[PDB]
Design a protein around this nucleic acid. Structure first.
Length: 93
RNA sequence: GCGUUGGAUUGUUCACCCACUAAUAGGGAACGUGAGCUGGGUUUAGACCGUCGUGAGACAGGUUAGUUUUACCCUACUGAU
């Protein structure tokens, strides 16, 4: 089975159950990669913004910015619910 | 022209207080004066704490411990032939 969802034809052997399970696995893993990368970037940029005006602190944070830029160069629908209705609903006789 | 202080806390400059006093004026002289002193502070190397840092370490912050050499020359000055 071959899917088109990201301008790439992804070809995994099997059925929609196996393909959907495999795609859910890879989406979970790439969400975790994306999440760890943005947590690390958030920590680095937080220390960089924490450094105010000094010589030593801005040079340490400028070093961390070099590390960060080196890392950057290395890389539905809904149903509205029912009213409370008695159990007899319809009677065709 | 002559005089403008004694003390407490602080390394103090400044400071504010107690007390006397006629008065408790302000300053300069390489911010007088370290081959005149002292070396409390600052500001090498030891060490502690907080904060920041992944770390080595940083501190706009605190605390302690830390060697300060020579005149017999010319001159100036004071005295002496």
């Amino acid at each position: 089975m071959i899917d088109m969802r990201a301008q790439k034809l992804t070809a995994y052997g099997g059925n929609y159950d196996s393909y959907h399970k495999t795609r859910s696995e890879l989406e979970t893993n790439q969400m975790k990669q994306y999440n760890k990368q943005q947590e690390e970037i958030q920590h680095i940029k937080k220390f960089i913004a924490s450094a105010g005006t000094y010589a030593n602190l801005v040079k340490q944070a400028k070093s961390r910015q070099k590390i960060l830029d080196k890392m950057e160069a290395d890389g539905s629908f809904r149903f509205p619910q029912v009213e409370r209705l008695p159990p007899p609903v319809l009677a065709f006789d």
